[PDB]
Amino acid sequence: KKSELPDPFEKARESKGYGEMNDQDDPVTMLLRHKDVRKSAHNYKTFQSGAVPGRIVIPSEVDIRDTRQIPFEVDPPVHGVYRAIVEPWFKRPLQAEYQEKLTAQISEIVEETLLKGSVEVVTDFALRLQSRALTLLLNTPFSESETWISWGTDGDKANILYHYIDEQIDRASENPGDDMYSVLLNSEFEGRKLTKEEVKGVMVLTFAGGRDTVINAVTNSIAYLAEHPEALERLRKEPEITGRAVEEMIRYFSPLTQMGRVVTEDTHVCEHAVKADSRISLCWASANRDAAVFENPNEIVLDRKVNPHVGFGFSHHNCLGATHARQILKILLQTLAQKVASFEILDYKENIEDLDHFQRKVGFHNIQIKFNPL
Ligand code: HEM
Ligand SMILES: COC[C@H]1O[C@@H](O)[C@H](O)[C@@H](O)[C@H]1O
Predict the structure, then answer these.
(1) Pocket-testing residue among 23, 205, 317, ligand 2, by greatest number of atoms within 8 A of Cβ
(2) Centroid of ligand 1 to alpha carbon of 320 (angstroms)
(3) How many domains in the chain?
(4) Phi, psi for residue 129 in degrees, rounded to 5
(5) Domain residues for 205?
(6) 204 C-alpha to center of ligand 2: Å?
């Protein structure tokens, strides 16, 4: 029914192993099989991330930005050095105290929604929850979330973000405090301080990498719980399954469908030739439905123990935001289980990704849902 996300890649995954799409006259070969997505994600020499800024993104962003994202657009061994700088900052959501503040934010927004009765989840719920949670990760004042909410859910809009980041970098530059900007400006890369340009590459990536993905993860979870009262019930009675429930939702929703790489030399994948200087994609969504790897791949098995999903990527570039994202979803699932009796989906419109030969439901442009109290 309505919460379903179908697998548009099945026939091609099983028959050829790959697909094609056009994106700004820079054509893509999509890798669809779990085995191949892993081998290719691991093999950075042949399939590289350190390209012209914006080239590995799909759709390509070469025409809307010049700044290199870090560590996203850097290859090992330099990748490892930058990643070691920011990785302790990204593990902060594992702290008790960070989790209490996040529990209070999510709990407050769930109570407000139970009072309003019905709400438009994408904007009134998911975007608010994501913007506020992000203030904990950046360690900025709560109020900064109102600016981010205003941006909503593309050359001129892009520059709104880039210029905002520059202002923040300059402000922290003059008056160092404890926010992520100040921490990055004071960090060392091989015995010297990071430059503003490097900080900008971390921060643009931090804002852009976690916005849409989190908003869809949150929204798709609510949709799914709305149509599956038995799942809401298991989560209430068996809180111990919550962690595995979150991984299973990231596998099935795969909020980030694919990511590109640039092919450095002539080579083959599934007996198919790919020429140097072209792009492939690591199609995480398809790998996460591979019937050679997952039992019942097109359902949510709420307590799945064996779950080698690639929803957060694989090997070198595995998602730094995963710790933050996981805590958001763990807490959300428990807050709904302990406070909401059931839901009704009242009206919706689907967000379909145009991938040329493939049309992929990634979530909802909007969906109106009623929450009833327990
Ligand atoms: C459920 C939500 C999320 C999903 C599904 C997701 C998914 C992914 C995926 C698949 C990658 C691999 C990219 C690649 O191979 O090139 C990735 C990388 C990354 N994500 Fe996320 N992400 C999510 C949330 C976040 C959040 C909230 C942030 C930050 C606030 C974030 C920051 C990053 C960063 C910095 C990387 C690059 C890591 C590196 O290059 O070493 N993500 N993410
Ligand atoms: C790992 O994902 C990072 C990317 O997310 C994309 O959706 C952004 O738009 C890109 O600029 C880039 O940050």
Answers:
(1) 205
(2) 6
(3) 1
(4) -65, -45
(5) 1-374
(6) 9
